[PDB]
């Protein structure tokens, strides 16, 4: 935001930090949702305390699903759940805000371990049978599967596509003050 | 690259995880693959229409926002900075120049 | 681009083209077409109505029929009586909804937001500085969604 | 011998200040929060009796509307307190032991600990 | 919302600007044909004089002993259990004295009060005295708030945790130059702002300005690397 | 009152007509059972007296109509301005957010209306609460004044507060050891007080801070509050920095009340154990994208001319909220706890980052 | 939510003061630094402040011995005679 | 005493000056914001009871 | 906000209403006044009756965004044209189906 002879040159675009805060929330949201619906597929009344996680130990779709979202929410690298707190850190570094990135990586380290504790409690001696039975079998539903399959795919690969979503959001987010 | 083939791809390799997912055969209730590739080449079909139309706008908008920003600088001067010959040639242009209405 | 013609049973489908895709315009824009009513009242819109919002009408009708019975599709436990009303009920809401749709079609050709059949004596000239979309849309059906690409 | 805007802020927050006081009683907190959304009534009217606006005065009468909704959740949640085994004394909900009870005593229930 | 303003000034671009300066001479001068009392009133300047030391050190105690005053109020005294006892001969003596709430709080809340004016007096001394000279500032508040608060941890809560005491002043010092001793969302200033003082004409600036323009059209990835199409 | 113009209210026809057709619907869901046989009725079958209804016609009832909204902002024309007495605002923002937390909870349902059919453990009035909420806080994200978002915010808590009510209690199970003597929950009754009684705080807190904008400015618009303050810095007027300072404070300790953030997260915990996985999937939307991006914006957008007093209280808090959670998340046994400590620990990120968008 | 209305019907005393704000902040291209009048005399009507300060002070001057009698008023003519007559 | 510019900076309100907008510390509402005992309480409440308290405006 | 003249403009006082119609064609009319007569600064008083219309039909808001309309129009008009703006555009969407090379051991700086 510099002047030359009373003409002014800015290459600062002013709404960049709401869109990156819109996709930090929707990220989060879309992680959430990948772990209730890997929660719903089952039986519901087997976790209610924080050791019965071995209970997600019962087939590989639902224990690797469920290794990712947690993973994804403890914001490994690969995962989408890296990308909004990665943008964060580059939004504070360009508002300059060292003692903001400082806070924000103790938070980020507690709240990883806080996170990646339960990846022990997974461990269990045999499969868990966590499923609900009709018609004398245990009830698969489809639907949720394909939509925890979507959520995989953009939990897996979501930082190639990300650029259009950053587009998106700074082009509503550039409707701000206009 | 095409939109229309990557999407029919996505939905082909999507129903077949599915599949695998829910433990069920592949094979298996095949009019399915033909309508997943189907609904998929729409959908990220329209998206790409959709990215491109919002770059458009969003470059447009930025030419508004240039424009919001100089004047909220101005406004945001310190008092006693708006007569400094620093602003004080800028700040004129836009109080009298710019009384064009 | 070219738009369904206004005062015909498809005009609504105008509704569904747009040149930018901003909900609404700026506080002293201007319209794309002239303004025939700019402070209608709710008389004055239900004046202006014509076979565009009747074919709005018409296909909410259509199309409520199978939004209903996938609707029923979720009925347990229930009787004859109730399952006939219930689907009413929501068949008589599409109807709505329908009326809704065409009323604010209305309300827009008064106001001049869509294709009234009138165009403007000086037409407003745009630089296409940035275009990302022109060639894409040439090459695609999506050239029937704009107007003036 | 005080100015009322002064005085009738404080009340607001005095009221506010003794209903963390006194003791989790549900029916004592509700007619405290009564009396705080009372004190809010007050207060809008003078405001809006100073300032000549007509809104605070609509304040007054949606004040005195949400108060009575909140009433009548109240005093649902008392009786459904009476279903639960719970006490409207909150604080004989729980074995912490408190020094501003006189008499708070619980054990468990056993008639004895050590059979031999 | 400031803190630190007197400290923060710029001198050259207040006085430039004409703006009110807080270094400014804030004090009074009795003259002659005036009373003796108003002689003796006008001595009320010495609590002014922020050159003083004894006044700072003053300052500074009062403010720790406020502070350890409303921790206690807020935090320290809940906490702690009294014995029942303790309690029973405190509620006995308020039923035999006219004010003897006064007293009970005074008694509870002096070791607070104290320990509170002695850590801000020995801060401030600290601080005056030994770390007001060094070159890095960031470095120099670093390591002076984590000392003091690792010896604070260790005296006035058991030695075993000064490590986090250290822990804490190493933060505490880094908050405090970024937001005490630096001016991040308080700034008196507009950022790229300029005073001119030479004789050169408009003409002279403008042509500056323009080879400023392009030097600064540099700046720029595409520019510098030719790699733009052509319009 | 000379002529009632159509752009005054044009965007209420929509939500009145879902409204109409959603509560018509349920007074007629009502009465299901009432079917008179007369006299010279014949019954091809002996009617059934016991029944239970699935709400899955209801949900995809809800989703029907959600989707028609979509279709009516698609379609969507007019100008960037206020309406209904400048009480609400139409311009490209607050219709994009309109429309994302549509399309949010048009997924939320579609996938609520895909797991119900696996076991049916909730009621029909549990989704009209759904219905009621999801037509209500986009108009929450449509405000232009604090009275009307106050005003909304509590007509979408009573609708909160009704699906915690309805909320099933008793199962059945496999449990045979518990006849015949009496075991106490308490869950229910947790959730109903914390949820009452921090609703109450904000409520309380809200409605002073509207009182003092009203003595400060004149109005609680946006636009309005935002103008007055900034001259007023320019102009050294108003020079009470007391009264901004509470006035400000007020406001953020009363959405910290009601967001359950870091200093006071403490009943999230409670409310969250007492509740169901599908309360808590629908809470955790409404919260994230209604409720904390409104937190947001108030800093961002809406009362930005208080910037330079709100930063330092911001900054105070996210210091305290870390240091008050790094050490209690560690000593958690409850999966409802993990989750609800998972979104305290996010919004204390996302309130750092705002400390640094508002710099 | 400023509806220029007064506690019985009328017209809010601050309606112009408003309208002149807000007629101003409209048209400028920098409102908040060029229409400093407009608001200050708007935030006089609201608050009082000048009225305040007018009135600590007369107290103030009140407090001395300044003053000793004041002109007498007849009813008949607009005219102040002295006291002393 | 403090001087004449002082004096009409004191007295000096508002910038425009054709706009009336006198001081009151608040506005009447009641009785269509009016007055109905323009009396000491005394007065009001004695006048109605005992002669000699209203002056008969005729 | 507080420094947007788009949200200003949508601030307006109770039972305030614009007649957009009159409006524009009022504005229609002088800018046709205007845009026969060419200058680098538009001079409303070259103009006076159509000027006189203008101010007493459109608001102080909406004058102000058709200024700041007009003055990027013209800012615009004087630097592109429509067949190099379709040959840039062009040339742009094709190259970026390519990627970009680091100019290594450059000379300019
Ligand atoms: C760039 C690389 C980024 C890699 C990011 C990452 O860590 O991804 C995890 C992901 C873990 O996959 P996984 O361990 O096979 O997961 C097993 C299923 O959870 C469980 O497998 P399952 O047998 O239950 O079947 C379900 C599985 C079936 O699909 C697969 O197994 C395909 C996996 C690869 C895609 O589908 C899914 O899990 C969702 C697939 C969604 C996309 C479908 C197209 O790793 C990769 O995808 C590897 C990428 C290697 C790239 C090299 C260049
Ligand atoms: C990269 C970033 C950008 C990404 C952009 C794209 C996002 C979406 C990607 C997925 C879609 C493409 C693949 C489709 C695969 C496929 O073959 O599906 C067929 C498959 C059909 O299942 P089926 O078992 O064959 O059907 C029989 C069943 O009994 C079920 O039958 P039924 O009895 O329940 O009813 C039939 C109904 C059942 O299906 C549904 O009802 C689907 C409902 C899903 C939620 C949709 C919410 C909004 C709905 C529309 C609202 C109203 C619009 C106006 C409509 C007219 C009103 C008069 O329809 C169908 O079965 C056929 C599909 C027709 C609807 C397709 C809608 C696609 C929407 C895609 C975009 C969504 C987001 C847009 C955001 C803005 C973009 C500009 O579809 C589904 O099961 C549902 C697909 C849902 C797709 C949308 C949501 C996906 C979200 C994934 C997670 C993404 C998170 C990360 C994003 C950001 C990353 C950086
Ligand atoms: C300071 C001047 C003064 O009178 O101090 C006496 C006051 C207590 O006098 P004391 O000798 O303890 O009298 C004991 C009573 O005879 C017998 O004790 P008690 O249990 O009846 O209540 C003792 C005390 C209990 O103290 C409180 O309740 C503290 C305040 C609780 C929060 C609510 C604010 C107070 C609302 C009522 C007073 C508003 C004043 C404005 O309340 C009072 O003495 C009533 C006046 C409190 C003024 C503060 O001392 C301080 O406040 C220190
Ligand atoms: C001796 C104590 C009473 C006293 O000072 O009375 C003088 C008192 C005159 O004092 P002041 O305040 O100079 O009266 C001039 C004010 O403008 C009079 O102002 P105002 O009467 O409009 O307002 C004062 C009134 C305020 O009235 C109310 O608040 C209405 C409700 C009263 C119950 O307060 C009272 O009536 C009671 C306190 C005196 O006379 C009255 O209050 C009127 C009744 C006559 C005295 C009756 C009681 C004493 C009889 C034996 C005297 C030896
Ligand atoms: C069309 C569907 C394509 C994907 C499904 C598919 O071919 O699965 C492999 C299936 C077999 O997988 P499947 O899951 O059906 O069988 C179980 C696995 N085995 C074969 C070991 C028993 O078909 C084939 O492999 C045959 C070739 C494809 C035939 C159809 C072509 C069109
Ligand atoms: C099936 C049961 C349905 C519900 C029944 C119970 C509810 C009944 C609600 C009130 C109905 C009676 C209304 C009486 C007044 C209007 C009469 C009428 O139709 O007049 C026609 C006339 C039509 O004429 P007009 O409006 O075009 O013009 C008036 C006439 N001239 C031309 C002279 C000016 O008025 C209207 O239709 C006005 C409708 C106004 C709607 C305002 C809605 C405000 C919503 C605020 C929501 C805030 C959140
Ligand atoms: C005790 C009864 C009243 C007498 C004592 C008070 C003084 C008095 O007479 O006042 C005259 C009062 C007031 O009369 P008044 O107000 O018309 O005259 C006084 C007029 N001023 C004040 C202007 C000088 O009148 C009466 O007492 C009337 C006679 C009442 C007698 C008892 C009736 C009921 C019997 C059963
Ligand atoms: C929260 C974030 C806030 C914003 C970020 C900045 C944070 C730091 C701001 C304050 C910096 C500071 O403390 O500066 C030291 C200050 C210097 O003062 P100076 O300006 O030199 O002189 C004026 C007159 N002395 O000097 C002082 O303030 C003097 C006192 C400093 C030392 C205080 C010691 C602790 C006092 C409270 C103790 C409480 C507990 C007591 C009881 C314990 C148990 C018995």
Redesign the pocket.
Request: avoid cysteine.
């Given at each position: 935001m510099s002047i030359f002879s009373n003409i002014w040159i800015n290459n600062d675009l002013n709404s960049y930090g709401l869109s990156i805060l819109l996709l930090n929330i929707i990220n989060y949201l879309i992680v959430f949702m990948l772990i209730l619906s890997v929660i719903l597929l089952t039986n519901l009344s087997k976790f209610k305390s924080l050791n019965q996680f071995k209970e997600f130990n019962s087939y590989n779709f639902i224990l690797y699903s469920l290794i990712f979202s947690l993973l994804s929410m403890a914001g490994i690298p690969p995962l989408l759940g890296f990308t909004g707190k990665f943008l964060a850190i580059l939004y504070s570094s360009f508002k300059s805000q060292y003692l903001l990135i400082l806070f924000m990586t103790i938070l980020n380290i507690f709240g990883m371990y806080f996170y990646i504790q339960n990846l022990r409690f997974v461990v269990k001696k045999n499969k868990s049978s966590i499923l609900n039975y009709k018609n004398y079998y245990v009830n698969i539903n489809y639907s949720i599967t394909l939509n925890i399959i979507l959520l995989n795919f953009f939990n897996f690969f979501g930082i190639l596509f990300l650029s259009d979503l950053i587009i998106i959001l700074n082009y509503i987010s550039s409707y701000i003050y206009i | 690259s095409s939109m229309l083939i990557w999407g029919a791809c996505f939905g082909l390799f999507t129903r077949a995880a599915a599949c695998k997912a829910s433990m069920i055969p592949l094979t298996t209730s095949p009019w399915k693959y033909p309508k997943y590739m189907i609904v998929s080449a729409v959908t990220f079909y329209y998206f790409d229409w959709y990215r491109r139309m919002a770059l458009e706008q969003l470059c447009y908008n930025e030419e508004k926002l240039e424009r919001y920003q100089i004047r909220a600088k101005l406004q945001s001067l310190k008092i006693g900075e708006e007569l400094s010959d620093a602003y004080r040639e800028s700040f004129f242009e836009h109080a009298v120049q710019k009384n064009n209405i | 681009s070219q738009t369904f013609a206004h005062d015909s049973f498809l005009g609504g489908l105008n509704l569904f083209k747009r040149r930018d895709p901003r909900f609404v315009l700026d506080q002293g824009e201007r319209p794309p077409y002239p303004i025939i009513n700019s402070n209608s009242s709710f008389v004055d819109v239900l004046s202006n109505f014509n076979k565009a919002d009747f074919g709005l009408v018409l296909f909410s009708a259509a199309i409520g029929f199978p939004l209903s019975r996938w609707v029923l599709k979720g009925l347990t436990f229930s009787s004859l009586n109730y399952r006939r009303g219930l689907f009413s009920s929501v068949y008589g809401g599409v109807i709505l909804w329908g009326l809704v749709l065409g009323f604010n079609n209305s309300y827009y050709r008064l106001n001049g937001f869509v294709d009234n059949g009138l165009v403007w004596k000086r037409k407003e000239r745009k630089l296409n500085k940035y275009d990302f979309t022109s060639e894409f849309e040439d090459n695609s059906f999506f050239k029937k969604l704009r107007i003036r690409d | 011998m005080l100015t009322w805007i002064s005085f009738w802020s404080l009340i607001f927050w005095?009221i506010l200040?003794?209903l963390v006081?006194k003791p989790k009683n549900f029916i004592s907190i509700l007619f405290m929060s009564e009396l705080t959304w009372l004190a809010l009534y007050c207060l809008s009217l003078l405001f809006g009796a100073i300032y000549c606006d007509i809104t605070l005065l609509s304040i007054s009468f949606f004040i005195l509307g949400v108060a009575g909704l909140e009433f009548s959740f109240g005093i649902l949640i008392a009786i459904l307190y009476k279903n639960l085994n719970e006490s409207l004394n909150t604080d004989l909900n729980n074995n912490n032991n408190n020094q501003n009870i006189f008499d708070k005593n619980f054990k468990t229930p056993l008639e004895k600990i050590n059979w031999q | 919302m400031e803190l630190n303003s007197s400290a923060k000034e710029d001198s050259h671009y207040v006085g430039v600007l004409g703006y009110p300066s807080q270094h400014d001479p804030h004090t009074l001068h009795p003259k002659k044909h005036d009373s003796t009392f108003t002689k003796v009133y006008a001595c009320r300047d010495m609590l002014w004089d922020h050159h003083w030391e004894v006044r700072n050190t003053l300052y500074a105690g009062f403010k720790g002993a406020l502070l350890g005053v409303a921790y206690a109020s807020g935090f320290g005294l809940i906490s702690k259990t009294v014995p029942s006892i303790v309690l029973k001969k405190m509620f006995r003596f308020?039923r035999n004295?006219?004010?003897?709430?006064?007293r009970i709080?005074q008694d509870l809340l002096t070791p607070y009060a104290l320990t509170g004016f002695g850590l801000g007096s020995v801060y401030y001394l600290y601080q005056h005295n030994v770390w007001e000279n060094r070159s890095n500032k960031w470095l120099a508040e670093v390591l002076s708030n984590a000392l003091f608060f690792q010896v604070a941890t260790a005296v006035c809560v058991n030695p075993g945790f000064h490590i986090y005491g250290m822990v804490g002043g190493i933060l505490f010092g880094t908050l405090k130059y970024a937001f005490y001793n630096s001016s991040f969302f308080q700034e008196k200033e507009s950022i790229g702002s300029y005073t001119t003082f030479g004789d050169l004409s408009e003409e002279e600036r403008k042509k500056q300005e323009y080879k400023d323009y392009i030097q600064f059209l540099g700046n720029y990835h595409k520019v510098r690397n030719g790699q733009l199409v052509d319009l | 009152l000379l002529r009632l113009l159509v752009s005054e209210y044009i965007f209420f026809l929509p939500v009145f007509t879902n409204l109409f057709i959603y509560w018509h619907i349920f007074f007629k869901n009502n009465i299901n059972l009432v079917n008179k046989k007369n006299n010279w009725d014949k019954s091809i079958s002996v009617k059934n007296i016991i029944i239970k209804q699935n709400p899955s016609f209801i949900i995809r009832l809800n989703l029907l109509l959600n989707s028609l909204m979509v279709l009516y902002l698609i379609t969507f024309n007019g100008y960037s301005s206020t309406f209904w007495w400048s009480h609400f605002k139409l311009n490209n923002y607050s219709l994009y957010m309109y429309l994302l937390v549509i399309i949010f909870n048009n997924y939320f349902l579609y996938i609520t209306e895909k797991h119900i059919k696996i076991l049916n453990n909730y009621s029909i009035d549990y989704f009209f609460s759904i219905i009621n909420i999801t037509l209500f806080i986009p108009m929450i994200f449509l405000s232009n004044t604090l009275f009307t978002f106050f005003f909304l915010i509590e007509l979408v808590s009573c609708a909160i507060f009704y699906k915690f009510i309805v909320s099933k209690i008793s199962f059945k199970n496999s449990n045979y050891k518990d006849n015949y003597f009496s075991i106490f929950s308490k869950n229910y009754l947790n959730v109903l007080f914390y949820q009452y009684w921090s609703s109450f705080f904000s409520s309380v807190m809200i409605g002073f801070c509207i009182i003092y904008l009203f003595s400060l400015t004149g109005s609680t618009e946006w636009s309005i509050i935002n103008f007055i303050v900034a001259s007023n810095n320019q102009i050294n007027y108003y020079t009470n920095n007391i009264t901004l300072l509470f006035i400000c404070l007020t406001l953020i300790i009363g959405f910290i009340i009601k967001l359950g953030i870091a200093p006071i997260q403490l009943y999230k915990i409670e409310i969250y154990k007492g509740l169901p996985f599908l309360s808590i999937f629908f809470y955790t939307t409404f919260y994230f994208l209604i409720f904390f991006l409104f937190f947001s914006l108030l800093f961002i957008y809406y009362l930005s001319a208080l910037n330079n007093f709100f930063w330092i209280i911001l900054l105070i808090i996210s210091i305290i909220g870390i240091f008050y959670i790094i050490s209690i998340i560690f000593d958690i046994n409850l999966f409802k706890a993990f989750l609800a400590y998972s979104t305290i620990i996010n919004s204390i990120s996302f309130i750092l980052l705002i400390i640094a968008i508002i710099f | 939510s400023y509806s220029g209305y007064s506690l019985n019907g009328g017209v809010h005393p601050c309606l112009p003061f408003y309208e002149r704000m807000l007629q101003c902040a409209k048209s400028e291209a920098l409102p908040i630094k060029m229409c400093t009048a407009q608001t200050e005399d708007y935030l006089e009507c609201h608050h009082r402040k000048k009225q305040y300060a007018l009135n600590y002070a007369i107290k103030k001057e009140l407090n001395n011995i300044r003053i000793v009698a004041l002109p007498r008023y007849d009813e008949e003519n607009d005219t102040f005679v002295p006291f002393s007559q | 005493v403090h001087g004449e510019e002082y004096a009409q900076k004191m007295q000096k309100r508002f910038h425009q000056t054709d706009i009336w907008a006198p001081f009151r510390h608040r506005y009447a509402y009641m009785y269509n914001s009016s007055n109905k005992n323009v009396k000491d309480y005394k007065q009001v409440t004695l006048s109605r009871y005992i002669n000699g308290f209203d002056k008969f405006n005729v | 906000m507080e420094f947007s003249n788009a949200l200003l403009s949508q601030t307006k006082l109770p039972g305030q209403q614009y007649d957009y119609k009159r409006c524009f064609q009022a504005s229609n009319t002088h800018f046709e006044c205007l845009d026969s007569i060419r200058d680098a600064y538009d001079n409303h008083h070259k103009c006076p009756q159509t000027y006189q219309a203008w101010q007493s039909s459109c608001d102080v808001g909406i004058r102000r965004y058709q200024m700041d309309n007009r003055e990027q129009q013209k800012k615009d008009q004087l630097l592109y044209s429509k067949e190099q703006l379709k040959n840039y555009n062009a040339a742009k969407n094709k190259e970026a189906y390519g990627i970009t090379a680091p100019k290594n051991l450059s000379f300019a700086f």
């Open positions: - | - | - | 005095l200040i003794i006081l | 308020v004295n006219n004010f003897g709430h006064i709080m | - | - | - | -």
